[PDB]
């Protein structure tokens, strides 16, 4: 099947960010997270906390836009209520 990515930005007052694996229930709402799915991504950055992830996340998602040339399409938010699109939620949940 296609080949999905987990990336989590976050780590409440010790900011901490790094790759992970396939994880819907084991996510973390509440910092910013990133999938990238073939040529889309979303990051699904989570309004529970802003700055740490936003900072380790914004980081991240500019190293992957300068490794992909933007080639493909990418979804950013961090959000908190909704957190679950049955898109996104589909794509790496389902």
Known sequence: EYK???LHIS??????????????????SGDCFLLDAGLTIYQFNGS???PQEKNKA?????????????????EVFCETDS???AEFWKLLGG
């Not at 901490?16 to 973390?28: F, H, I, R």
């Open 4 to 6: 999905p990515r987990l």
């Open 11 to 28: 780590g409440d007052k010790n900011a901490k960010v790094a790759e992970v694996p396939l994880a819907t229930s084991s996510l973390n």
């Open 48 to 50: 529970k906390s802003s």
């Open 58 to 74: 914004a980081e991240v998602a500019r190293a992957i836009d300068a490794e992909r040339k933007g080639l493909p399409k990418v």
């Open 83 to 85: 957190d679950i699109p």
